[PDB]
């Protein structure tokens, strides 16, 4: 499973729910090889593949857990790939949409005990935890997160 398998498997529930165009994963792969998003989250490996957003019909997040970590390139220079265990796929219509969730995810990946729960929870327990935290946020209205956006790989 390379980055392209991970992206297309995470974009698949988005395209079926009618929130991104048909060739959505191919756009985010194109931007992944231009401005990658490998993040050495202080404990775990985290990648946030996202895109421009004119082909995005609604803001959504698709979460993917990697039991076997996969190398992702990081934007922070350093031609040393990142061992990534959690993938946060993002689709936002406008620049104003993506900036809000990006700071929210920055607070997600700087919460070790929360983050440690993701590694050893099922697709149901993960949805219950991210939904409850998205609900408590005063922003984040307009992002969609249903039970079909959690996938282990």
């Amino acid at each position, epitope marked *: 499973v390379t980055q392209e398998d991970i992206i297309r498997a995470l974009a698949s529930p988005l*395209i079926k729910d009618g*929130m991104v165009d048909e060739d959505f994963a191919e756009y985010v792969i194109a931007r992944e090889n231009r401005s990658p998003t490998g993040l050495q989250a202080k404990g775990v490996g985290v990648a946030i593949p996202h895109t421009l957003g004119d082909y995005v019909r*609604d803001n*959504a997040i698709s979460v993917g857990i990697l039991d076997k970590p996969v190398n992702f390139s990081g934007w922070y220079q350093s031609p040393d790939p990142v061992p990534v265990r959690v993938v946060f796929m993002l689709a936002g219509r*406008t*620049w*104003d*949409d993506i900036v809000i969730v990006l700071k929210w995810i920055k607070d997600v990946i700087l919460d070790e005990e929360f983050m440690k729960r993701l590694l050893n929870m099922s697709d149901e327990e993960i949805y219950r935890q991210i939904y409850t935290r998205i609900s408590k946020a005063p922003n984040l209205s*307009g992002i969609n997160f249903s039970r079909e956006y959690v996938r282990h790989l």
Partner: antibody, heavy 122, light 112 residues
């Protein structure tokens, strides 16, 4: 009942700018996207742009772009549209219209505003 | 952009007859199992009202005498019994890609 009460009619001199208000009620204001549609004197509809009331992010039609500005006021549940460098071609009726579908990408329109007549002349 | 050729420009039917409004899109506005097509009714001096969304679904409150069909590029709005209050102008609209475009409009006047 969902209601989109709009501002009053406006007379604008050519080259100036106008800003139209659109108060919303009867639903959680930030939940649904807000759109603006212009209907010329020929009763032909042209979509101007959408705005996310929660993030402020807006997408515009290319024809009206660089002249249209979409803003919201989250406290009062009011949507604003600003059109600059007005000419006689922009003399039309401007509607604020609600999305209708919550989070599905349907992107239809369920409720059209009361309407604001904008006349541009010297 | 997508050009939508709505037809007919004017439609004269008798009371209780059948009214058929057609709308053709210059591109396939259907993607996945989603037909991004919507119909609106604008009575004279009123803002438009939503009739059909997703080319077949009736909005809550719209009487069952309105129907929608079509897939791909050709779509049709039908009124099985035409009533006296149905005199208005009907517009089609696509949600496939930005910018959204409308049809030129179909004016329904009933014979008498």
């Amino acid at each position: 009942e969902v209601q989109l009460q709009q501002s009053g009619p406006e007379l604008v001199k050519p080259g100036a700018s106008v800003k139209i208000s659109c108060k919303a009620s009867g639903y959680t204001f930030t939940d649904y996207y807000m759109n603006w549609v212009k209907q010329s004197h020929g009763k032909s509809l042209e979509w101007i742009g959408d705005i996310n009331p929660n993030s402020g992010g807006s997408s515009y039609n290319q024809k009206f772009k660089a002249r249209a500005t979409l803003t919201v006021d989250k406290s009062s549940s009011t949507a604003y549209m600003e059109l600059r460098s007005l000419t006689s071609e922009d003399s039309a009726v401007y509607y604020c219209v609600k999305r209708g579908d919550f989070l599905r990408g349907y992107w239809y329109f369920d409720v059209w505003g009361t309407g604001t007549t904008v006349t541009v002349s010297s | 952009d997508i050009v939508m050729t709505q037809s007919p420009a004017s439609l004269a039917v008798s009371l209780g007859q059948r009214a058929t409004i057609s709308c053709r899109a210059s591109k396939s506005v259907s993607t996945s199992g989603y037909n991004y097509m919507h119909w609106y009714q604008q009575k004279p001096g009123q803002p438009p009202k939503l009739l059909i969304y997703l080319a077949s679904n009736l909005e809550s409150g719209v009487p069952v005498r309105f129907s929608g069909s079509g897939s791909g590029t050709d779509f049709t709005l039908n009124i099985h019994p035409v009533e006296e209050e149905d005199v208005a102008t009907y517009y089609c609209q696509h949600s496939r890609e930005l910018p959204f475009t409308f049809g030129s409009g179909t004016k329904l006047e009933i014979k008498r």
